[PDB]
Each structure stands twice: as C-alpha cells, then as structure tokens.
Amino acid sequence: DSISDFMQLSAFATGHKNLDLNIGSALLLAFEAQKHDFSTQIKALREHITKNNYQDVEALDAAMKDDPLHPTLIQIIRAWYSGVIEDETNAKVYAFEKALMYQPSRDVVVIPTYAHNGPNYWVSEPASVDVMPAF
Amino acid sequence: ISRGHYLAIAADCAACHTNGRDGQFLAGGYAISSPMGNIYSTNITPSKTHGIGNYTLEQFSKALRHGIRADGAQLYPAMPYDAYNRLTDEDVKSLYAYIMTEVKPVDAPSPKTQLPFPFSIRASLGIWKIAARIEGKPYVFDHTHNDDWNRGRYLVDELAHCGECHTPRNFLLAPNQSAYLAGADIGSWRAPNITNAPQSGIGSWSDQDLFQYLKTGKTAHARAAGPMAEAIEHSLQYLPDADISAIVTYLRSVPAKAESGQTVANFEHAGRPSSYSVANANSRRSNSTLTKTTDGAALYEAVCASCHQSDGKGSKDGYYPSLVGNTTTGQLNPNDLIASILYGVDRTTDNHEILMPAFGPDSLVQPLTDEQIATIADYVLSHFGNAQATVSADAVKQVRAGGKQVPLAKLAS
Amino acid sequence: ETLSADVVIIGAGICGSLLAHKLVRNGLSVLLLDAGPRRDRSQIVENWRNMPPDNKSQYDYATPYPSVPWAPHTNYFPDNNYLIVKGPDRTAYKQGIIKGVGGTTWHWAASSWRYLPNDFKLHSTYGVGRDYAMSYDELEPYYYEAECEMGVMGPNGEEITPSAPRQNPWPMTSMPYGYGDRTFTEIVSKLGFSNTPVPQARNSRPYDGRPQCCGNNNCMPICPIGAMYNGVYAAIKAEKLGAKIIPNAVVYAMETDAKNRITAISFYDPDKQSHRVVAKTFVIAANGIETPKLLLLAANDRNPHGIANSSDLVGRNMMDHPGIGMSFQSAEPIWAGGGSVQMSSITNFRDGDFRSEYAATQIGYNNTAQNSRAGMKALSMGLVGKKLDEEIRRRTAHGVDIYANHEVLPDPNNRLVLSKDYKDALGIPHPEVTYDVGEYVRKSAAISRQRLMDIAKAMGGTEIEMTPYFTPNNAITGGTIMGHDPRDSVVDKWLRTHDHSNLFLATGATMAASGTVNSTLTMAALSLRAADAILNDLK
Numbered sequence A: 001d002s003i004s005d006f007m008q009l010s011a012f013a014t015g016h017k018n019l020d021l022n023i024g025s026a027l028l029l030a031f032e033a034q035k036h037d038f039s040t041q042i043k044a045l046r047e048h049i050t051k052n053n054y055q056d057v058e059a060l061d062a063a064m065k066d067d068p069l070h071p072t073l074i075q076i077i078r079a080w081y082s083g084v085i086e087d088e089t090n091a092k093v094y095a096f097e098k099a100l101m102y103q104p105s106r107d108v109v110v111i112p113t114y115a116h117n118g119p120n121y122w123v124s125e126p127a128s129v130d131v132m133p134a135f
Numbered sequence B: 001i002s003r004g005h006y007l008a009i010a011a012d013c014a015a016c017h018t019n020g021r022d023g024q025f026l027a028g029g030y031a032i033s034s035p036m037g038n039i040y041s042t043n044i045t046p047s048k049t050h051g052i053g054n055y056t057l058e059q060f061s062k063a064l065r066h067g068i069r070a071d072g073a074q075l076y077p078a079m080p081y082d083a084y085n086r087l088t089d090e091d092v093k094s095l096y097a098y099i100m101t102e103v104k105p106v107d108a109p110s111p112k113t114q115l116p117f118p119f120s121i122r123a124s125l126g127i128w129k130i131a132a133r134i135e136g137k138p139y140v141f142d143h144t145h146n147d148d149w150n151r152g153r154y155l156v157d158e159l160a161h162c163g164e165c166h167t168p169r170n171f172l173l174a175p176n177q178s179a180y181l182a183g184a185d186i187g188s189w190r191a192p193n194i195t196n197a198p199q200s201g202i203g204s205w206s207d208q209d210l211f212q213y214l215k216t217g218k219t220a221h222a223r224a225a226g227p228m229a230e231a232i233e234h235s236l237q238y239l240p241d242a243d244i245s246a247i248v249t250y251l252r253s254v255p256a257k258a259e260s261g262q263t264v265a266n267f268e269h270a271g272r273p274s275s276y277s278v279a280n281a282n283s284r285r286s287n288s289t290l291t292k293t294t295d296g297a298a299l300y301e302a303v304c305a306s307c308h309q310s311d312g313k314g315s316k317d318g319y320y321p322s323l324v325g326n327t328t329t330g331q332l333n334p335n336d337l338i339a340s341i342l343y344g345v346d347r348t349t350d351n352h353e354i355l356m357p358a359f360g361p362d363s364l365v366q367p368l369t370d371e372q373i374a375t376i377a378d379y380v381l382s383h384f385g386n387a388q389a390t391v392s393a394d395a396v397k398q399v400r401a402g403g404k405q406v407p408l409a410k411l412a413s
Numbered sequence C: 001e002t003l004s005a006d007v008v009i010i011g012a013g014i015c016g017s018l019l020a021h022k023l024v025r026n027g028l029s030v031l032l033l034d035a036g037p038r039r040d041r042s043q044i045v046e047n048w049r050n051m052p053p054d055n056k057s058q059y060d061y062a063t064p065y066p067s068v069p070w071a072p073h074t075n076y077f078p079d080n081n082y083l084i085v086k087g088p089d090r091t092a093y094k095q096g097i098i099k100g101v102g103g104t105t106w107h108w109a110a111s112s113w114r115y116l117p118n119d120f121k122l123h124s125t126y127g128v129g130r131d132y133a134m135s136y137d138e139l140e141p142y143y144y145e146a147e148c149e150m151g152v153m154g155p156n157g158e159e160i161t162p163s164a165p166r167q168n169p170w171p172m173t174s175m176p177y178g179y180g181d182r183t184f185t186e187i188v189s190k191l192g193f194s195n196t197p198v199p200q201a202r203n204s205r206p207y208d209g210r211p212q213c214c215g216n217n218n219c220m221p222i223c224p225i226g227a228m229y230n231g232v233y234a235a236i237k238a239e240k241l242g243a244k245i246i247p248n249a250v251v252y253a254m255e256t257d258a259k260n261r262i263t264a265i266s267f268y269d270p271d272k273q274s275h276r277v278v279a280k281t282f283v284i285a286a287n288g289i290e291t292p293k294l295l296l297l298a299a300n301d302r303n304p305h306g307i308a309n310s311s312d313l314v315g316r317n318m319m320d321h322p323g324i325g326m327s328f329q330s331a332e333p334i335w336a337g338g339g340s341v342q343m344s345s346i347t348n349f350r351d352g353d354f355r356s357e358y359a360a361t362q363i364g365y366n367n368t369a370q371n372s373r374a375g376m377k378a379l380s381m382g383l384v385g386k387k388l389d390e391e392i393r394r395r396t397a398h399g400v401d402i403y404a405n406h407e408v409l410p411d412p413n414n415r416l417v418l419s420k421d422y423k424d425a426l427g428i429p430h431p432e433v434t435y436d437v438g439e440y441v442r443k444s445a446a447i448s449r450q451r452l453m454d455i456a457k458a459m460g461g462t463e464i465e466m467t468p469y470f471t472p473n474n475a476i477t478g479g480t481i482m483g484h485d486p487r488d489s490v491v492d493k494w495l496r497t498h499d500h501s502n503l504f505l506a507t508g509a510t511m512a513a514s515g516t517v518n519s520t521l522t523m524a525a526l527s528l529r530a531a532d533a534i535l536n537d538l539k
C-alpha cells in the first residue's frame, strides 16, 4: 500500500513511468527512517494531485508553492534523480547508473565506471542536444 | 602462397611448433600440457644439425603420418599423426617441399621432453598405436557426397584435426570414435559438442553464424577463447572462404551425439531480469580489499559489470559479448566459463586483438580466489547462463590445476 | 625475526614497485615494505560507485580509498587534516596521496610525460631554479624502459612544440580523440594554442595482458578494467618473482654505524609492535612528502637533524605545479567524457626564452564526464519535470573544465617541518608544508589567467567560475634535492644519499626542477637509474 503509493507519487513527480522497484523500496525505507511521518506527507501530496487534477509535475510545482509539502516533493525528486537523500559526504547512495540524472545524457556521455559501446566509440559524432534520448 | 604453405597453415603445424609469439617459427620449444607431463614440440626448420634438414621424403612422411622419427623412435601422441595418417601422398610431398624450401633454418635446440616412467621411454608407444587403431588408408573422395562435403571432411579430420580436441578420449587416451566430435576435456578448457545435435551441439547455429565464428572467432552468441583463440588466430582465419564453407557443410552432416539433461541450445538461454542492489553496497564502503563481499551479484558488479553491462547483455556494438544467450555461459558444463574467468580471452584476428583481462591468482587487474570465482560463476549461470549448471570452489581449483587428472596418468606415481 | 634481505625498499608505490621488480629480475632478494594496506581494484570501484554524487561532481579522488588510522592519507572533502599546509599559498599544496600497496598511482590520471632537455639544465640555460645532477641523454634509456614497462601510448607520428626528442617511438599510438578534445583542439588552434595529445600510460590496444581502454572516463580515481598503469602491477610482478611484500609496515626509525652507513631499520604494524629489518642496501621510495618526513622523523645521534640531512635540505625546495582552475558553460556543446580524463593539453608554452622571467605553463582541458556535475547543479536550481531533464542535458553537453599549471622554482623556505601539534595513531607527527608560490609563478599566472579568459571567450562561455587561489596538481617533487655538492644537495646523480652510501632515495623528492608537466614518468626513470646503481653496487 505505502510502497505502491510512493511509487505512484515518484512516477508522477519525476515524470518517468519506468522506476526501479528495489530502488524505490530502499528510498522509501530511508525516507521513513529519516522522517517518521513521511507517509502522511505522501498521502497529502497524492490527495492534492487527485483533488486539483494536475496533469504533470510542472503544474503541481507551479501551483502549491509555499505549501509545507513543497520541500518533501523536491526531496523526492532529488533522491530519485541523484540517488541520495542527505548532503553529507557519507550519505548512502541508493542508485548509480540507474539514477535519473544520468539518463538524459546516457546516449552520449558515459556513466563513468560503466563502459559505453566498445573501446573507440568516441570517434563517432555525438547526438544533438535538442533531442531527449528515452525515459 | 604455395600449396605446401596453404597445407601447413590449414594443418596448424605452426601453432604448436612455434613457442608462442616469440621464438622464431617452426623452431619447436612449445610446451604442450599433456596429462602425464609436458611434451615439447621438436624443431621443424630445415636445419641439418638441429632441425629436420636431413629428413628424406619417406622419413618425413613416416614422421608426419605414422609417428616414427628418423632414428626410429616413436613420436609422442601430442603429434596428431593419428589425424595426419590419412593425408594424401601429394599433400605430404607438398608439405615436405614447403618445409625444406620455404622456411629458413633455425639452429637452436628445443627442450627435451622428460616424462615420468613408464612414459619416459618412447618405445611402448607401438603397443599404444596398435591398440588405438591409428593406421588407415590415405583419404579418398566419397562419390556419394559432393566435392564440398569431401573437402570439408578432409579439412576437419586430416588437416585441421578438429577431432583431436573435440572428440573424447578412452582409457588409453586414444580417440573414441563412438563419440565423434561429441565434446572433450583438453585440460583447463573443454571443447563443446559440435555435432548436428540441435540442443546439445551446434545444430541450431545458423550457417552464417558458424561461418563467421570459424573465420573470425566472433559472433553474437559465441566467442572463441583458449585453444580456439590460438586455432582461429593461427590457422582458421587464413583459410579461404571456400574452405570454411566446406567445413560448415561437412559439420552440418555430422551425426548428432546428444548430451544428458539438455533441453535448449547453449546459446538460447534467456537472461533473468535481475541484478544486484546498490543500497546494500553502502555498508561495504571503507572496506578495501574486498573479502567481506561474499555476494555473487555484488562481486559480478564490482569485477565484471564494467564491460558486460549490469544486465549481462554486453555493449551495444558487440565488442563486449552478451553474457545472456552466450554459449560459454549457456553450457551445462561450466568448465569453459571458469576457464574464461581464470585465464581470459586473447584472440588476434586480422591483426586486431581483443583481450579479457585474466582474473586468476596471477591476475594483474583483479586477482580472485576460488570462492569468489565460484560465486561470480554461479551468479552468471543463474542470471545469464545455464541455471542448472553450478560452480564450486573445488571445481575452480581443479580447473586451475589443469582439469581432471585422467586415471592413466595416476599410474606414474 | 630480523627480516633479512639483500635490499629493502620502503614504500610499494610506482617507484618502489618498479625498483623491486627490476631488482628481483636480476637475482636480488628484495623486501618491500608499505605503510598502507593491500587494496583491491574492484572494491575501490565499488566504493567510488557508492560515493555520493556530490563527491563525484567535485573531484574527490581519496574517498574510495579508506584512510587507515596507522598510515593515514589525505582526504580533502571532510579534510581529515593529515597534511597541514601553511603559507600564503597553502591551498596550492593540498596534495592527494594514497597509502597502500600500489601507492598514489592507484588513482592517478596516468599522464606519463618526458621532461624536455632544458628541464635538466634550467639553471644553466635561464638562470633560475636548479640544475639536475644528470642530463636528459643520461635519462633517455631509462625513460624508454619505463615507457615500455608501463605501456605509454603517445602521438607516434607527429611534430610537436618541444616534446623531449625520442630515440624510439612510443610503445603504442595515441588513441583517437573524443568529441570534446577535437572541439577544444580546433578552438585553441583558432586561438593560437597548439593542442597536442598527452602521452598516457593507457592501452590503445591490448598490452601486458591488460585490456584496451573502453573510455570509462574514470582514470581518476580508478579504472574499473585496469587499462591504465598502476604501481600495483609492478608490485604484483615483483611478488611473483620472489620479492616479499609486507603491508601495514610504517617505517619509523633507522640505525647508523660509525661510517654513517645505514645498518637496520624498524617499522610499526597497526598494533604498534616494532619489527627490525637488516639489509645490505636500504631504499626509501615513499613520496615527495613521506620520504622527507621519514628522514626527519628518524633522526639519530649521529644525525641529529635527520637522516641524510647534513646540508639541512631535507624537506626544503618543495615544488609542485600550482594550477588555476576554470569552469564555464560553452556556447557550443563539448560533450566532455569521451575517452580518458586527460587526453590533450596545450604544450605551446612548455619552453621558451620567457622562462628566465616567469614560469612556463601547461594549459589543458579536463575530459572528465560532466553528467554528475550537471545533474547536481540542475537539481540545485530547483527545476522539475521536462525542464529538469533539458537542463541536465544542456549542462552536461556544455560543461567545460579548464586548468593551467605552472612551474615553481625550488625555494628553500618551502619546508616539511614535522608538526608539533598533530600526530596519528602510532604517534608519528603529521607532515607540515609551508608553501609559497613565488614571484615566478605569480608573474606566470598573471598571463595564464588572461589565456584562460581568452579560451573561455573563444567558446562563448557563460557562468565563468575561476579559482581565486592556486590549486594543487599532486606532483610532489623536491625535499631531497639532487646535485654534485654534498653541502648543497641530499643525493648524487645516482640517487644515493651523500651522508650514507648505503641509502638510496628513489622518489620524486630527488628532482631538481618541477618541470611543466606531470612528473611520475621521470620518477620511474630515476627509480630505474637507482636500480642500475644498486645492481652495480651489489655485484
């Protein structure tokens, strides 16, 4: 129930339907450990989306500004995109090579440790900036 | 090139008579890991003092086919004279001319092979040849089949001697003609079944895939390593397209020898849509020298996932093979997978070389223990290869030691 | 146990491991001691993968390697304060080091550079700095031997603004440029700067049983497939040949006889249990920082000021490459990340008559992937949805990092006094560097900043961020200066200490000039020269 609610809210906020279930479960567990009332904020956010009928996260962010639910939404987006929740240097990393902040350049820029296609791929010309690859 | 040169290339005599990349060529000095010890290839360059320069046509034919030296001593079965016995007389003459005239002599003695008793003396090998039914008439064309089939059979049996390593041996280490091309263990590596069995062998392989694998050693579902690396990079890649087509045509007609407990082809194993957890690896930070990383998925991600992607599908351009749907990982016997992990892949085709880094104890990139290699192999087999196969640390240690010791070798103790 | 050996080398870095491998290749028994622990490449890769993305955006090269309490190394993101730096340019000497079997070459960029012939006679040619005890010709065979050993690729067929004329071509040929390097080369060529390939200890083809680099673009701080060179390779090769390696061996004291020869040394394990080691020839190959620290810490009754410190020059004359960073968003996409982290640099200003007035520079372009930096920056802007993805893509396509390193003369006041305020778990004082960049480097930077501004303007850069201070470049040279005069130097042309004929210093601290490019290849060449000297001595 709570895990499905968190996954649905994450899919709405990040704007991408394909989200790893294990990464989402780990993120939810970490969020509940960090904040003991996280699920209440999740339900309040989803209630806001359902009541106001927000088409995408652009409208939800444009409205609802200055509400106390903005920080948790931004935290969810940052956790899904970067893979961490805390700003410290020992913060646990929950997603690398699958974090959503690497995907928009996955087709050109190499996710460092993991190799691109072959030992001389960079001889080829890169794709245009104005096209979004996938997801 | 001359006919003798082409025959020498096809017979792969330069692969075993040349001590690796260095050591001139056809000069001998290459150590063959026989089950009972090391057998060193003799010098072949036409040196009248240290080579076979004084060999006559009849003496060379005897040495090549019947395995009898010029002095009369029996050559060790490391020579595939059981395969060359059926070579035509014209082919033997062309090879003799090529060796006499087309290779510069090298005056450098090769190490003498010293085997333990009773293999120390090379005189009991006459009884071994008698028991092995080695003798046979020179090859002639079978009129029931076309010329392509006959040439393919000639190349597979006589010249390229595929059955030397792809056919299992009996108790006396003689070829087991009953299980023709049914797959064999040749030490650290295992040659898979290459019969026309749709599931056990290569019957399901496409003709284009088989041709590409034989010519280059690289295909979407299989990559050549170990003895194939040497065989393709020394003999097969230089053969004309007609010869490879003939070999494929003959292989398509090989009778099938099914394996026990085989349901799908080695290259038809789908990959499990699973992987490791990044979150679980956080506790293993500040923990250099990974000894607490006992998880198979974590070990694979740390060691192997850089090149073969985390899902095991490899790189997009195919340079790094897809472990999903791969013959080596899809084999029921995980000997080839363990050997690939331990020693790596090194194949130089058309002057371009791929290279797996070795991951055994002598590794430079990342040495691995038997338990770690077993865990990685188990994860790869369960998620990307044959689920039924399993790897234990004892299997890895045995592959490191050189494979199962044959019962015949135990007699020299 | 007294742990006897023919030669004991303190420090299993690139220099120590190369020396040990060369020695054991010639029938000498070698004992290899390292203060750090054994490290596994795959575990370091896993540590880097789980390092927070903010530690990847800003270049953290030490967090993947855990800092053992008994032999700590620098870690500048929490700033463990192992290496205290003072002086007007303390920020310029916050050097990164890694302690362990393999040393700092565990996380280097593997830019193996050959010094110009004038770098060895700087003082005789321009009247500044100090002259090397040996000429470039005397180091050329050892340069080539090191290059062959580590497999240094380079621009085989090319003509370069002076680039250390070679007797033999590089073992490899330089791998093809990525898109960012090609664009940078074209832009700087239009600007008048010559962008040339950097000779790297990288595999453009399979070599030494190591794969070709797939362009992971993570040379700093770990290559997952081992396609670069690391000192751990030489350590493994030496161990395979019979050399004994004792990790977690923090050498702290040396004993000398009447003839000032070194008779025995002692080291601590993590439990602070002292073990004695006796050998015929002693070699200290630790660092440009750890070697002078060991020399000063082990002062004896015969050497009150420190081992081989009769000239009072141990720890003095420390040099580096004070760099000026620059980050901006190029108007045109650069798509940084294709290939290695350092594929090219501007070698136009590596030599000239201007070196008599101000330092020579090496302007370069950083090829590290900007996806982590772009993602962190875009998230910091509070963007959501499609705009966030577009901003991430734009910032990772236009992200450019530009640096400009200089050469600093050997200044006697750049000391390495042992800290009187800090210690470690074993009670060994922390090193302390008082670094002053000097008017030489200041005058050089006065022009280098204009050059960086011109480069930024050529690309139409926006959000131009420039470091107001001087950044380190981890080329720790000097500390035990070399020369002919025993009262003006620590070691002779054979890397043998003047005070003790029994001791060899196979480190970068022996170099008489920092040069303009990275200096580990010269360190390896000097280590091989010292290997030749030791072999001649013992035979």
Ligand SMILES: Cc1cc2nc3c(=O)[nH]c(=O)nc-3n(C[C@H](O)[C@H](O)[C@H](O)COP(=O)(O)OP(=O)(O)OC[C@H]3O[C@@H](n4cnc5c(N)ncnc54)[C@H](O)[C@@H]3O)c2cc1C
Binding pocket: C010, C011, C012, C013, C014, C015, C016, C033, C034, C035, C036, C061, C071, C095, C096, C097, C098, C099, C100, C101, C102, C103, C104, C105, C106, C107, C108, C109, C110, C111, C112, C113, C220, C231, C249, C250, C251, C252, C285, C286, C287, C288, C290, C291, C294, C342, C473, C474, C475, C476, C507, C508, C518, C519, C520, C521, C523
């Ligand atoms: C991020 C980074 C990037 C770099 N990039 C480049 C580059 O592109 N090109 C280049 O040429 N150079 C580069 N360098 C520099 C290069 O890493 C060093 O110059 C080189 O590794 C020096 O190694 P060394 O053997 O002299 O000492 P190290 O390898 O640093 O250390 C040797 C060993 O001695 C041990 N030790 C120290 N003190 C003691 C003691 N008291 N007792 C016992 N053992 C001890 C240490 O544990 C260590 O393992 C880079 C450095 C860094 C940090």
Ligand code: HEC
Binding pocket: B156, B160, B161, B162, B163, B164, B165, B166, B186, B189, B190, B191, B192, B193, B194, B202, B213, B214, B222, B223, B224, B225, B226, B227, B228, B231, B236, B247, B251, B266, B327, B328, B335, B336, B337, B340
């Ligand atoms: C004569 C020219 C041939 C032909 C037609 C084939 N071989 Fe071999 N082979 C050898 C080894 C050790 C392997 C496997 C390596 C590993 O485990 O990765 C192979 C593999 C093959 C295949 C692929 C089958 C598959 O992977 O499922 C094929 C089609 C094949 N071979 C055909 C060993 C040898 C060898 C030395 C003992 C010699 C000689 C040959 N092979 C010769 C041939």
Ligand code: HEC
Binding pocket: B218, B221, B222, B223, B224, B225, B300, B303, B304, B305, B306, B307, B308, B319, B320, B321, B323, B326, B327, B328, B329, B337, B340, B341, B345, B346, B347, B353, B354, B355, B356, B357, B359, B376, B377, B380, C211, C214, C225
């Ligand atoms: C982690 C230890 C592993 C495992 C289990 C495997 N690899 Fe690799 N691999 C690499 C390359 C370049 C090749 C092929 C060579 C060529 O085609 O030129 C391979 C091959 C394999 C195989 C064999 C496939 C087959 O025979 O069909 C197997 C079973 C295999 N690998 C498993 C490259 C790398 C590499 C560097 C990029 C790394 C690291 C690994 N492999 C690691 C592993």
Ligand code: HEC
Binding pocket: B008, B011, B012, B013, B014, B015, B016, B017, B032, B039, B040, B041, B042, B043, B044, B051, B052, B060, B063, B064, B069, B074, B075, B076, B077, B078, B079, B080, B095
């Ligand atoms: C190109 C076809 C080919 C020719 C021609 C050839 N060999 Fe040999 N050869 C050997 C070994 C091993 C011996 C010696 C062992 C013995 O004494 O029984 C030998 C012995 C010989 C001898 C005997 C000379 C002497 O001084 O012992 C001749 C002649 C010879 N080989 C020629 C391994 C090989 C191998 C395996 C790598 C291959 C393939 C091979 N040889 C292929 C060939």
Ligand code: F3S
Binding pocket: C202, C213, C214, C215, C216, C217, C218, C219, C220, C222, C223, C224, C225, C226, C227, C228, C339, C340, C341
């Ligand atoms: S060292 Fe190599 S593996 Fe890639 S990160 Fe650099 S090219």
